[PDB]
Automatic annotation (TrEMBL):
Residues 25-129 form the Guanylate cyclase domain. The gene is cya1120. Mg(2+) 2 binds at residues 162, 165. This is Cya1120. Keywords: Calcium, Lyase, Metal-binding. One of its GO terms (biological process) is intracellular signal transduction. Ca(2+) 1 binds at residues 30-31, 74. GO terms for molecular function: adenylate cyclase activity; metal ion binding. Mg(2+) 1 binds at residues 30, 74.
Length: 176
């Protein structure tokens, strides 16, 4: 029962796409309960839904100077030069969707501490997104701290353990 986010993250670990034409902040998004939704409405409706969704997402990403690295149906991997753009993009996407399909959105950015920085950051971003509820924007501590000028507000954060990662991580949801 792998999500499109997980499929893209596994792809990205091996592909190692060159983001020299963007730089880094990584955003992952997919549709909550996509498989169940697909099985409910059937493939022809799904194709229509996905093409429409793809148009929405790609346009909003580009409007925020983002670069869709790869998409897998409902899933998107997106790169931004700055965390402000990534979060604003997420805010705009959630608003458009409310204006019933709901998307998970996770955002992460990271620095080297010694190493394989890209491998860790992409994997981390995917897990953050995997932790997000439909309709939620979740960001890692570094993104939260990097945006601590508004008007972007966060909750008090939640401590979670991410699959395959040692330690615990505090994740913050973006608020209205």
């Amino acid at each position: 029962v792998r999500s499109s986010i997980e499929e893209l993250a596994d792809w990205a670990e091996v592909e190692r796409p060159d983001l020299a034409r963007v730089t880094v902040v990584i955003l992952f998004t997919d549709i909550e309960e996509s498989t169940a939704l697909n099985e409910r409405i059937g493939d022809r409706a799904w194709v229509k839904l996905i093409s429409s969704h793809d148009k929405l997402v790609s346009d909003l990403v580009r409007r925020q100077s983002g670069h869709v690295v790869k998409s897998q149906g409902d899933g998107f991997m997106v790169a931004f030069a700055r965390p402000e753009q990534a979060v604003r993009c997420g805010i705009e996407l959630q608003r458009a969707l409310r204006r019933e399909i709901r998307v998970r959105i996770g955002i992460h950015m990271g620095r080297s501490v010694r190493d394989d920085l890209f491998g860790r950051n992409v994997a981390m971003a995917a897990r953050v997104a995997a932790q997000a509820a439909g309709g939620e924007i979740l960001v890692s501590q570094p993104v939260r701290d990097a945006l601590s000028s508004d008007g972007i507000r966060f909750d008090d954060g939640r401590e979670v353990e991410l699959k395959g990662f040692s330690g615990t991580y505090r994740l913050f949801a973006v608020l209205a």
